[PDB]
């Protein structure tokens, strides 16, 4: 009978509204986290001077 | 050789001494911690029919006897307490699951409404007269100059409806203070206790708010087997009912919020 | 497992968030939605403190790297990073671990909250806890912020944070003269006195000389009134002690909040306002 | 909303209570009571009566003598200008005999007043000790206070009397002044190589933090179960109630284990007594056994190494 | 969990539709970020 | 890419007021966060002064 | 493990719900952990200048 | 512990296959990881 | 010993469940622990540059 | 331990082979590890 | 002698269920303890660079 | 305590050699250890 | 062995159990103390290089 035709049934073990809310929470935290993570490396998009140096856009 | 530095100095060995006395101390305090509530409740005990009494480490300390003053008794700890049915049913048959209270939640006497069976006798003053008694029984007591007299304020439940009015005030004969508010209930003119801990004042209005229960619930306040004194048993029974309203008195304190 | 009188209280509900989703127990700990979040914040935090101990300040092969319990330390980035996220291996790690610790403490508090809601007891404990959480935040969030950089936070290491306290304190020459410091110290001490007195009293009455029965409220009051002419009474001593301890934390938080941001000079000099009044 | 049991919102009076009766030998009680509506706002409004025996009076006596030597000396130090005394009071103080004198009884003008104030203060403290034991016996109770006070006295004696004598110098005892005694503390740590790496002072610090943690927790708990008369710890101890049950359970569900209404007071008691007992041990070893704690900690490999990013060449070595 | 077997098809249907909607919006943002700034 | 939408039903499961303040609060925080991030970085607009740095209008 | 066909019997002993949530948390945290562990070593995939240096696409 | 011996039959199948699905995406991801950037 | 047992009677003595879960938790912990132990010594396998150094196979 | 004499035979049976599964995978990783990089 | 006349009945005085666990915990604990203890002295067995130095003498 | 006199005989029997199995792996491991890495 | 004779009556005054345990504790402590005392003085027998120095069985 294979599977994935009765995995709707998952909501007989996990109450759906709450599961959504938990998911949303996870999403917001994971989001800020990754943003910081990417910000912690070279691919940074803030202290890069894009498109022009802004910290030396005010000393000259 | 007048210089062979010893690697062990008094501070090392004294920190060692400390840690050993420490360990013995911790253990001992954890033994006093099991003078109540033990041995624990698992389905390990019930599955085994009981050959697995749960106690953990360290073990339980020999009973100790408290000799109550005034022909009061003798209490022991740890003691053997008779099991007591649960007025609820398992939210899940799976372990660690909570139980839902049976019936009208506030009546259940389960959850925030639960309580044990303390003696059906009264706490006593040093002399041996009922410690907690009403100001009507305690002639001498008196409001403090400049404090609204609770006597005559209106008791009002959580949804703003009057419940009754303060018919008297119960006090401690041992440590002078307001312990209980008396409530002549409006809905049936029966008398109930209201713990001070559950009562908020509204002095300019001469009111006595109660977020705890609804005005109606005041009708079911557990009662006293004598109106001029109260027993230990009755104090628990009284407070716990009000406490129940903290989770039961509305179809929302149940939580969630989101 | 439960206490011998616990089943009768293990009611369902009371959450703030989650409802029946995580509304269950595990052993003796209550879980709940904030326990799951808490356990996540905590575990990742600790596990990261473990990676920091593993790598050391100059790499896993360096002599400064260490697993010695007294010396492992993860310190913040330099000030040059200001309020930006700094590279992982340059104080970044410390920042993340901090986020996890703050989140774990706030989760913990909220879980005590769901627990108060369940048991129908007051919310005095998690409120009180929130003072330590506040203190922790000034020491890692507020102060370093007012100071334009997260590097002003203390490192997470058993003795290195002691070193931190030491040099930050000595930047002001004689910290003992900090007046909020003097207050906070007094509260920590007074707290320690009331605690020792309450402890002593209860244990002196519920267990008297052999041959005597459990003592009474009258005894309690008569004793401290005998010795020092006053007895604040049973209830209130529980009230005072809570005042002393929470205040001690408070004044510690303010005593350090003013050390930098609101005062840069040495601290004894502060007392100048007193030697210079026009009374003398 | 719900009352927090912070402020007695409505109080009540009864004729003051002179208290449980003491047996023969424990002298009458003196003074006649009064009520402070404001103490009453937060606690028992009754002020006194107090007991004063031979002990208690002889202690009040010694103690006030000691307070006078310290004070008079401070007025003398600013020249009897009470204005100046008021101005520098925080900075005023009575310094100890100078080292040139060792443990000899020094001249009035050089410290002898300190030795007299130290003498009389200690005697008055230990008399207050005996007082609290007597006051604790007349009531049939136990000596739990007296064993704690004895711990705090221990630390005191360690600070100003035991260490100085062992070190052979009254100048090592602590001087009487607010700011001066602050300086004695700091100088003390500096002289002995940073007291932070002194383990005993770390434990005592763990126990002070702990007295704050325990009293904060327990106090918060008891107020949270103050709706169940949880403050009435005596009867919750003999006849366990839902206050002691909800109380033990709050902690059980939060951190996995718990104590009982009686035992939490044992954890608290022992933790306070522990501050003073590690503390005194800590001072006992300073100079007598260890002279440089930072070094001691290095010898036991507990002191951390940081990349040496800043350094200074030692002129003593040029 | 107060659901019937048919009331777990419906919720599941809408949930799946919305989540794949989320993952989709996600794939777009990962594309713009990929175009302007390939990371691999 | 399935058929049922009607995602209005969402308010039959999640309390609207609390959702409201939840969003309001989150937006204010996210706002302060992002503000702090850009001002602490290159795209900064305060530590500049247009048309000229003003504390260099006074060498004196 | 339980690898002997009668390895279903494991769910009479370990409650599916609790085992489930622990699996969930343990997996999420473990993932974040491992990711950051790697982001902190030479196998870093962000702080490399891939595929062209970005901090010279803005600064100097 | 909420299951019958027959329901401990049901849970186990989806649990095993699903855990296997996760493991699949994982091993997949790891082979993928090895091609672009060998680590051992 | 060539002795895969003696008596299997042990499950009349130790809760099958508790030993199960304990083995699981303790094993995962023992695993992370030893993992870290190895990553901190010469025997480390990430910061080794395997099989070719990556932070200088590309611009820098 | 509230189990029968037959299922402490059973539990034992499935558990042992299980433990061995773990131990096998263990020896696999360890031999492979001594191969790629010997430690003693 | 030293021959021990009856070392059964030792399980009539001391609960076996407990005693096993006693040994189990104590042994795992002592295991960790001793492991780290040897790990802290010359008898160290890891940071020996066996059989060839893996740092900066390892293929890389 | 709450055992029969026959089942602490049985327990003792199984326990002794089980303990010894442990001791066996122990002297074995220590033999291996003594061989590869002598300590005195 | 009192030595004679009604000094048994001493256990009519002071609890035998208490007296016993008291001596046990008192001695068990005192032994450690003097052990320590001996460790810091001329009678020290360990860090003495007696009869041959062991941290001179190699180098350290
Ligand atoms: C220079 C020193 C040598 C060294 C020499 C030795 C020697 C010598 C020995 C070891 C031994 C051990 N070594 Mg070595 N070892 C070294 C290097 C290592 C390294 C490494 C990183 O390189 C590792 C990981 C190890 C690891 C180990 C462990 C596998 C083992 C001890 C396990 C134990 O405590 O038993 C735990 C004891 C038990 C009885 C527990 C059995 C398990 C049971 C089922 C408990 C599980 C938990 C339980 C189920 C919970 C129960 C539920 C509760 C009742 C509620 N060694 C170095 C190279 N090693 C010992 C060994 O081989 O085993 C004999 C040993 O004698
Ligand atoms: C070094 C030179 C200065 C000095 C400089 C400083 C500096 C600098 C500081 C202090 C600080 C303080 N000093 Mg000082 N201090 C000096 C001399 C003294 C003396 C003395 C006898 O002379 C005393 C008594 C003190 C005492 C004090 C306290 C008043 C105060 C810290 C309270 C606190 O942290 O609360 C707050 C409590 C917390 C933050 C803990 C929060 C708990 C969190 C939420 C939970 C943690 C959970 C954690 C995970 C638990 C782990 C458990 C495991 C998981 C199982 N100092 C010397 C003179 N002192 C600190 C202060 O002012 O207050 C902050 C400070 O920053
Ligand atoms: C300043 C440099 C060092 C410092 C040096 C010292 C020194 C030196 C000492 C302490 C001491 C203490 N320090 Mg410190 N300490 C520092 C930093 C800290 C920090 C911090 C956050 O960094 C903290 C929390 C602490 C905390 C503590 C306390 C835990 C500890 C003793 C407490 C106590 O109450 O004893 C005080 C209680 C008593 C003395 C007993 C009081 C009883 C008497 C009898 C009361 C009499 C009342 C009287 C008769 C009434 C009449 C009044 C008359 C006018 C007199 N220190 C810095 C690092 N710290 C003690 C210590 O640890 O020693 C090892 C000590 O002596
Ligand atoms: C140079 C050294 C080698 C190396 C040497 C080793 C060696 C040697 C070993 C490992 C082992 C493992 N390594 Mg390694 N490892 C290295 C680098 C890594 C890296 C990395 C980032 O580079 C990672 C992520 C790992 C990760 C892992 C884990 C996959 C594994 C052990 C986990 C554990 O404790 O299980 C805990 C175990 C359990 C929790 C039990 C299994 C789970 C359940 C019981 C199974 C399902 C049972 C059944 C279906 C019933 C269902 C029950 C429900 C699950 C409840 N290694 C380096 C490259 N690694 C160990 C291993 O492989 O394990 C076999 C091992 O022996
Ligand atoms: C040997 C090197 C150390 C020594 C190390 C230890 C150690 C180690 C221990 C003791 C212990 C004991 N020691 Mg010692 N002890 C020594 C010096 C002394 C001296 C002394 C006058 O010098 C005395 C009285 C003692 C006394 C004793 C007891 C207090 C105590 C054990 C029994 C007990 O308590 O009951 C009272 C016992 C007695 C009153 C009998 C007195 C003991 C002997 C006969 C006294 C020897 C000195 C004596 C004058 C004869 C000397 C020989 C002549 C010079 C030729 N020791 C020397 C300095 N001692 C044990 C202990 O404290 O725990 C129980 C212990 O573990
Ligand atoms: C404010 C008044 C006092 C107080 C109150 C207080 N503290 C409290 C409470 C209250 C009322 C609780 O109810 C709560 C509790 O659960 O009781 C034990 C708590 C608490 N008091 C504790 C600690 C604590 N409180 C302290 C102090 C204080 N707390 C004040 C003295 C102190 C100090 C420094 O003196 C400490 C250490 C905890 C045991 C507990 C809260 C524990 C908790 O919330 O657990 C969740 C978090 C974890 C399990 C760890 C998370 C992992 C992190 C990611 C890593 C941690 C990084 C850390 C920042 C590094 C620090 C390294 C150190 C070596 C420096
Ligand atoms: C765990 C140890 C903690 C602790 C415990 C502790 N403290 C204690 C005790 C205990 C157990 C007591 O029993 C005792 C006590 O009495 O408690 C209320 C005490 C004590 N702790 C005190 C102080 C104290 N304890 C401190 C510390 C500590 N004590 C630790 C925190 C501190 C610190 C370091 O901050 C201080 C300042 C005192 C209140 C008391 C000891 C008082 C004492 O010894 O008295 C000596 C004599 C005098 C003070 C003279 C009396 C002066 C009068 C006020 C004058 C009245 C005049 C009157 C009107 C008569 C007219 C005069 C005539 C001559 C004309
Ligand atoms: C069994 O019960 C018991 C009794 O009952 C019979 C007893 O009577 C007794 C006897 C008890 C006593 C005699 C009490 C003794 C107390 C002592 C010695 C403490 C000494 C205290 C003082 C001298 C007063 C000090 C305080 C002040 C002067 C007030 C100053 C106000 C200030 C600084 C500003 C206030 C503002 C802040 C602190 C900022 C923020 C603070 C907070 C947020 C704290 C919050 C507090 C709460 C409570 C919720 C015991 C021990 C007992 O255990
Ligand atoms: C239901 O069936 C009934 C009839 C009961 C019968 C069933 C019976 C059954 C199944 C019984 C089961 C028995 C089993 C499985 C027994 C197994 C026993 C084991 C594994 C025993 C192991 C014993 C280990 C011992 C005793 C080791 C002790 C080691 C000690 C005390 C070491 C101390 C170490 C020191 C002091 C080291 C110091 C060195 C350093 C430097 C670390 O010190 C700081
Ligand atoms: C104008 O003022 C009038 C009212 C006269 C009086 C005013 C008095 C005032 C205002 C006094 C103010 C006093 C203050 C503020 C004092 C503060 C003191 C402080 C903060 C002290 C801090 C620590 C001090 C310690 C620990 C002292 C320790 C001293 C000891 C332990 C001394 C022991 C000495 C002994 C036992 C003496 C032995 C003598 C022997 C017998 C050995 O001689 C042979
Ligand atoms: Ba002037
Ligand atoms: Ba800018
Ligand atoms: Ba300007
Ligand atoms: Ba860039
Ligand atoms: Ba290393
Ligand atoms: Ba790279
Ligand atoms: Ba080696
Ligand atoms: Ba390597
Ligand atoms: Ba040697
Ligand atoms: Fe209390």
Dihedral sign for Cα atoms in the order I22, I23, I28, I29: positive
**F14–B257: do the CB atoms touch at under 8 Å?**
no
Q: Are strands B75-77 and B178-185 parallel, antiparallel or unpaired?
A: unpaired
The tokens for D232 are: 């009435």
Tokens of F47: 């530590």
Residue nearest to atom 40 of ligand 9 (CA): K34
Distance CA M42, CA M30 (A): 19
Torsion of CA C223, C224, C229, C232, to 10 degrees: -130
Residue with tokens 């501070």: B11
Distance CA D264, CA D252 (A): 13
Which residues line ligand 4 at a C-beta cut-off of 6 Å? G 1-2, 7, 10, 14, 19, 34; H 40; I 24, 27-28, 31, 45; J 22, 25-26, 29-30, 33, 37
Closest residue by CA, ligand 6 atom 7? C129
CA distance L16 to K11: 12
Is residue C256 within 8 A of residue C143, CB to CB? The reply is yes
Residue of chain H with shortest Cα separation from G43: H39
| Preceding omega of B256 cis (within 30 degrees of 0) | yes
CA distance D164 to B154: 67
Residue owning tokens 């879960």: I21
Q: Which DSSP symbol is given to C2?
A: B
CA distance A19 to chain G (A): 11
H or E segment to which residue C26 belongs: strand C25-26
What count of other Cβ atoms lies within 10 Å of the Cβ of residue G27?
Answer: 11
Please give the Cα distance from C199 to D268 (Å, whole number).
6
Residues of I in contact with B44 (CB under 8 A): 15, 18
* Domain ranges within chain M, ordered by starting residue: 1-60
Cβ proximity of C10 and B92 under 8 Å: no
- Residue K7, SS3? coil
Tell me if C39 sits within 8 A of D281, measured CB to CB: no
Å from CA of L25 to ligand 9 middle: 13
Token pair for J21: 């599964």
Q: What residue owns the CA closest to ligand 9's atom 34?
A: K30
CA M53 to ligand 19 centroid distance, Å = 8
Q: Are D139 and C201 in contact (CB under 8 A)?
A: no
Structure tokens at E12: 């599941």
Return the ∠ at Cα A45 (arms to A43 and A49), rounded to 5°. 115
Say which residues have a Cβ less than 8 Å from residue F21's Cβ, sequence separation at least 6: none
Domain containing B87 equals 1-117
| Assigned token pair, D144 | 């739990």
Report the alpha-carbon distance of residue C13 to residue B99 in Å, rounded: 10
CA distances from I28 to G27, I3, K26 (A): 12, 28, 19
Closest CA relative to residue D229, chosen from B193, B167, B30, C112: B193
DSSP code for C260: B
Query: Who's near G46: CB < 8 A, 6+ residues apart?
Result: A37, A38, A40, A41, A42, A43, E39, G39
Q: Is I12 on the interface with J (CB under 8 A)?
A: yes
Encoding tokens for residue B50?
Answer: 């009981």
| C182: alpha, beta or left? (left if phi > 0; alpha if psi -120 to 50) | alpha
Q: Calculate Rg over the CA atoms of chain K.
A: 22
Q: Strand pairing of C25-26 and B154-156?
A: unpaired
List B77's β-bridge partners, or say none.
B64
Residue B184: strand pairing partners: B165, B191
Q: Which of B241, B233, B156, B137 is nearest to B202 (CA)?
A: B156
Q: Which of D289, G9, B20, C125 is nearest to M28 (CA)?
A: B20
CB B235 within 8 A of CB D241: yes
Count CA atoms closer than 13 A to K50's CA, side-chain side: 10
DSSP L1-40: --S-SSHHHHHHHHHHHHHHHHHHHHHHHHHHHHHHS---
The three-point CA angle B192-B195-B196 to 5° equals: 130
| Nearest partner of B39 among B10, B84, B78, judged by Cα | B78
Resolution (A): 3.3
Burial class, H36, CB count within 10 angstroms (exposed 0-12 / middle 13-18 / buried 19+): exposed
How wide is the angle at C-alpha H35 spanned by C-alphas H29 and H38, nearest 5°? 100
Contact H1 B92 (CB under 8 A): no
Residue with structure tokens 């050993």? B20
Check pocket membership of C171 for ligand 2, CB cut-off 6 A: no
Q: Is the CB of C198 under 6 A from ligand 8?
A: yes
What does DSSP say about strands B207-209 and B154-156: parallel, antiparallel, or unpaired? parallel
Distance separating alpha carbons of residues B200 and D3, to the nearest angstrom: 5
Task: Report the separation in Å between the CA atom of C85 and the middle of ligand 18, taken as the mean of its atom positions.
Answer: 29
Would you say B166 and B118 are in contact if contact means Cβ atoms under 8 Å apart? no
Shortest alpha-carbon distance between residue B47 and chain I (Å):
10
Residue of F nearest to B252 (CA): F15
The structure was resolved experimentally with: X-ray
Per the document, the length of chain J is 40
How buried is residue F43: exposed, middle or buried, by Cβ count under 10 Å (0-12/13-18/19+)? middle
Give the Cα separation of C242 and D202 in Å (integer). 24
User: Exposed (0-12), middle (13-18) or buried (19+): which is B141, by Cβ within 10 Å?
Assistant: buried
Secondary-structure class of domain I1-60 per CATH: few secondary structures
d(CA C74, CA C155): 6
Residue from the list B118, B144, B145 with its beta carbon closest to the beta carbon of D241:
B118
**What's the gap in Å between the CA of C84 and the closest CA on chain F?**
6
Report the CATH number that the domain containing residue J18 is assigned in CATH.
1.20.5.250
Cα–Cα distance measured from residue G56 to residue I15, given in angstroms and rounded to the nearest whole number:
64
Residues 6+ apart with CB under 8 A from D253: C25, C28, C29, C30, C115, C118, C119
| Cα atoms found within 13 Å of the Cα of residue B117, Cβ hemisphere only | 6
- The CA-atom distances, in angstroms, between C189 and each of C247, D131, D208, D212 are 11, 23, 8, 9
Q: Which residue has its alpha carbon closest to ligand 7 atom 12?
A: D149
Taking contacts as CB-CB distances below 8 angstroms, the residues of chain F near E10 are: 4
- CB-count burial class (<10 Å; 0-12, 13-18, 19+) for D95: middle
Say if residues B112 and B246 touch (Cβ distance below 8 Å).
Answer: yes
- Of the CA atoms within 13 Å of residue B50, those in its CB half-sphere come to 2
Q: Which helix H or strand E contains D35, and what residues bound it? A: strand D34-35
CA distance C203 to C239: 19
Q: Which of C121, B110, B86, C24 is nearest to D246 (CA)?
A: C121
Å from C28 to nearest chain I CA? 14
DSSP secondary structure string, C197-239?
A: HHHHHHHHHSS-STTS----HHHHHHHHHHHHSB---HHHHHH
B110 and B124 together in one domain: no
CA gap G48, A44 in Å, rounded: 12
Q: With the C-alpha atoms ordered L7, L10, L14, L19, is the resulting torsion angle positive or negative?
A: positive
Integer Cα distance of F17 and B257 in angstroms: 10
- DSSP character at residue C86: P
Six token digits for residue C175: 């910290």
Minimum distance, in Å, between the CA of residue A49 and any CA atom of chain E: 15
Q: Which ligand 9 atom is nearest residue L15's CA?
A: 13
What does the alpha-carbon distance between residue K17 and residue K24 come to, in Å, rounded to a whole number? 11
Residue I58 phi/psi, 5° resolution?
-155, 140
Q: Which of B68, C209, C202 is nearest to D142 (CA)?
A: C209
Chains in touch with B (≥3 Cβ pairs < 8 A): C, D, F, G, H, I, J, M
CA dist M36 and J37 (Å) reads: 49
What is the chain L residue with the closest CA to I4? L21
**C139 CB-side CA count, 13 A:** 22
Q: Tell me if residue C6 falls in helix, strand or coil.
A: coil
Q: What's the number of domains chain J is made of?
A: 1
The per-residue b/e assignment along C75-114, b for 16 or more CB within 10 angstroms, e otherwise, is bbbeeebbbbbbbbbebbbbbbbbbbbbbbbbbbbbbbbb
- With beta carbons less than 8 A apart as the criterion, state whether C116 and C126 touch: yes
Which bin fits B135, alpha (ψ -120 to 50), beta or left (φ > 0)?
Answer: alpha
Measured CA to CA, the distance from residue B43 to residue B91 in angstroms comes to 16
Closest CA to C56 of I44, K56, D312: I44
Nearest to D197 by CA among D298, D288, D294: D294
Closest CA to D235 of A49, B243, B118, G23: B118
CB of residue D104 inside a 6 A radius of ligand 10: no
* CATH code where residue B194 lies: 3.90.50.10
Q: What range defines the domain where residue J30 resides?
A: 1-40
On chain D, the residues whose CB falls within 8 A of the CB of B37 are: 245, 248, 260
Task: For residues D114 and D173, give the distance between their C-alpha atoms in angstroms, rounded to a whole number.
Answer: 10
Nearest residue on chain A to E12, judged by CA atoms? A8
- Do strands C73-74 and C156-157 pair parallel, antiparallel, or not at all (unpaired)? antiparallel
CA dihedral in degrees (G32, G34, G37, G43; nearest 10)? -120
* C259 three-class SS: coil
Judge contact between B216 and B187, C-beta under 8 A. Answer: yes
CB B235 within 8 A of CB B116: no
Tokens of B1: 């050789």
- Interface partners of chain F (CB pairs < 8 Å, 3 or more) are A, B, C, E
The tokens of C155 are what? 């490192």
* Cα four-point dihedral sign L12, L18, L19, L21: positive
Give the gyration radius of chain M's Cα atoms. Answer: 21
The helix or strand, by DSSP H or E, that contains position I20, with its residue range, turns out to be helix I16-39
3-state DSSP assignment of residue F41 = coil
User: Which segments of D51-192 does DSSP mark as H helices, in order?
Assistant: 54-77, 82-88, 112-137, 144-157, 163-167, 178-191
Return the HEC string of chain B.
CCCCCCCCCHHHHHHHHHHHHHHHHHHHHHHHCCCCCCCEECHHHHHCCCCCCECCCCCCCCCEEECCCCCCCCEEECCCCCCCCCCEEECCCCCCCCEEECCCHHHHCCHHHCCCCCCCCCCECCCCCECEEECCCCCCCEECCCCCCCCCCEEECCCCCEEEEEEEEEEECCCCCEEEEEEEECCCCCEEEEEHHHCEEECCCCEEECCCCCCHHHHHCCCCCCCCCCCHHHHHHHHHHHHHHCCCCCCCCCCCCC
CA–CA dist M28, B245 (Å, integer): 57
- CA–centroid distance, D65 to ligand 7, in Å, is 15
B73 and B204 Cβ atoms separated by less than 8 Å: no
Spatial neighbors of F2 by CB under 8 A, at least 6 apart, are E13, E14, E16, E17
C-alpha of C89 from chain center: 28
> Which protein residues are within 6 Å of ligand 9, measured from CB?
I 7, 9-10, 12-13; K 23, 27, 30, 33-34, 37; L 7, 10-11, 14-15, 18-19, 22
């Amino acid at each position: 009978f294979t599977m994935n035709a009765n995995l709707y049934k998952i909501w007989l073990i996990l109450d759906p509204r709450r599961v959504l809310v938990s998911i949303v929470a996870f999403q917001i935290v994971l989001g800020l986290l990754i943003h910081m993570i990417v910000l912690s490396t070279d691919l940074n998009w803030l202290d890069d001077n894009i498109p022009v140096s802004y910290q030396a856009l005010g000393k000259k | 050789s007048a210089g062979i530095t010893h690697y062990i100095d008094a501070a090392q060995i004294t920190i060692w001494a400390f840690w050993l006395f420490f360990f013995g101390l911790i253990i001992y305090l954890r033994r006093e911690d099991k003078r109540e509530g033990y041995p624990l409740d698992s389905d390990r005990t019930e599955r085994s029919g009981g050959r697995v009494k749960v106690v953990g480490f360290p073990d339980l300390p020999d009973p100790k006897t408290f000799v109550l003053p005034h022909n009061g008794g003798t209490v022991v700890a740890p003691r053997v307490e008779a099991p007591v049915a649960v007025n609820a049913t398992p939210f899940s048959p799976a372990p660690g699951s909570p139980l839902v209270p049976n019936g009208d939640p506030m009546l259940s006497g389960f959850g925030p409404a639960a309580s044990p069976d303390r003696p059906k006798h009264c706490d006593l003053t040093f002399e041996g007269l009922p410690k907690i008694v009403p100001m009507r029984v305690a002639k001498e007591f008196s409001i403090a100059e400049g404090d609204p007299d609770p006597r005559g304020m209106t008791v009002v439940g959580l949804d703003g409806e009057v419940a009754g009015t303060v018919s008297d005030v119960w006090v401690d004969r041992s440590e002078p203070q307001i312990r209980y508010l008396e409530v002549e209930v409006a809905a049936n003119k029966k008398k109930v206790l209201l713990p001070i801990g559950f009562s908020r004042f509204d002095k300019k209005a001469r009111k006595v708010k109660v977020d705890a229960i609804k005005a109606a619930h005041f009708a079911n306040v557990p009662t006293l087997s004598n109106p001029d004194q109260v027993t230990l048993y009755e104090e628990d029974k009284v407070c716990a009912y009000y406490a129940g309203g903290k989770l039961y008195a509305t179809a929302e304190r149940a939580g969630p919020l989101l | 497992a439960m206490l011998s009188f616990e089943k009768k209280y293990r009611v369902r509900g009371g959450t703030l968030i989650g409802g029946d989703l995580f509304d269950f127990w595990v052993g003796p700990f209550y879980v709940g939605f904030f326990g799951v979040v808490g356990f996540c914040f905590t575990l990742l935090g600790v596990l990261l403190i473990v990676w920091g101990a593993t790598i050391g300040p100059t790499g896993p092969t360096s002599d400064l790297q260490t697993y010695n319990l007294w010396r492992i330390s993860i310190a913040p980035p330099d000030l040059s990073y200001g309020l930006r996220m700094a590279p992982l291996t340059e104080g970044g790690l410390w920042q993340i671990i901090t986020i996890c610790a703050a989140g774990a403490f706030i989760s913990w508090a909220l879980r005590e909250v769901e627990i108060c809601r369940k048991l129908g007891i007051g919310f005095h404990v998690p409120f009180a806890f929130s003072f330590a959480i506040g203190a922790y935040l000034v020491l890692v969030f507020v102060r370093p912020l007012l100071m334009g950089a997260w590097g002003h936070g203390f490192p997470y290491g058993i003795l290195s944070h002691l070193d931190w306290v030491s040099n930050v304190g000595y930047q002001f020459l004689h910290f003992h003269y900090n007046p909020a410091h003097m207050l906070a110290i007094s509260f920590f001490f007074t707290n320690c006195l009331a605690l020792s007195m309450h402890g002593s009293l209860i244990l002196s009455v519920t267990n008297p000389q052999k041959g005597e029965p459990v003592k009474t409220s009258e005894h309690e009051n008569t004793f401290f009134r005998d010795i020092v002419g006053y007895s604040i009474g049973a209830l209130a001593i529980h009230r005072l002690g809570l005042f002393l301890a929470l205040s001690a934390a408070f004044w510690s938080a303010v005593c350090i909040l003013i050390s930098g941001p609101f005062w840069t000079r040495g601290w004894p000099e502060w007392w100048n306002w007193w030697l210079e009044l026009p009374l003398w | 909303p719900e009352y927090q049991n912070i402020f007695t919102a409505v109080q009540v009076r009864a004729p003051a209570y002179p208290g449980v009766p003491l047996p023969k030998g424990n002298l009458p009680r003196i003074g006649r009571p009064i009520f402070s509506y404001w103490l009453g706002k937060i606690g028992d409004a009754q002020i006194g009566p107090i007991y004063l025996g031979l002990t208690g009076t002889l202690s009040i006596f010694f103690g006030l003598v000691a307070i006078s030597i310290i004070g008079f000396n401070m007025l003398a130090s600013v020249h009897w200008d009470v204005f100046q005394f008021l101005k520098h009071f925080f900075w005023l103080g009575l310094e100890p005999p100078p080292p040139q004198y060792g443990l000899r009884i020094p001249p009035l003008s050089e410290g002898g007043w300190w030795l007299m104030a130290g003498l009389f203060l200690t005697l008055s403290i230990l008399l207050w000790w005996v007082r609290t034991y007597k006051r604790a016996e007349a009531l049939g109770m136990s000596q739990h206070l007296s064993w704690a006070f004895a711990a705090a006295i221990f630390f005191y004696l360690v600070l100003g009397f035991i260490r100085p004598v062992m070190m052979g110098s009254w100048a090592k005892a602590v001087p009487f002044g607010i700011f001066p005694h602050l300086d004695w503390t700091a100088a003390f740590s500096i002289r002995y190589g940073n007291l932070y790496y002194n383990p005993f002072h770390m434990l005592s610090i763990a126990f002070l933090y702990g007295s704050a943690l325990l009293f904060a927790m327990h106090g918060a708990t008891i107020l949270s179960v103050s709706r169940f008369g949880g403050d009435r710890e005596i009867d919750q101890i003999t006849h366990r109630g839902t206050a002691a049950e909800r109380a033990a359970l709050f902690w059980r569900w939060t951190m996995g284990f718990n104590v009982t209404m009686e035992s939490i007071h044992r954890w608290a008691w022992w933790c306070a007594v522990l501050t003073v007992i590690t503390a005194g041990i800590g001072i006992l070893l300073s100079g007598t056994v260890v002279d440089n704690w930072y070094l001691w900690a290095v010898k036991h490999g507990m002191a951390p190494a940081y990349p040496e990013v800043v350094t200074a060449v030692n002129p003593y070595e040029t | 969990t107060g659901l019937t077997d048919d009331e777990a098809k419906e919720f599941h249907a809408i949930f799946m539709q919305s989540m794949y909607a989320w993952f989709g919006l996600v794939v777009i943002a990962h594309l713009l970020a990929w175009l302007y700034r390939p990371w691999l």
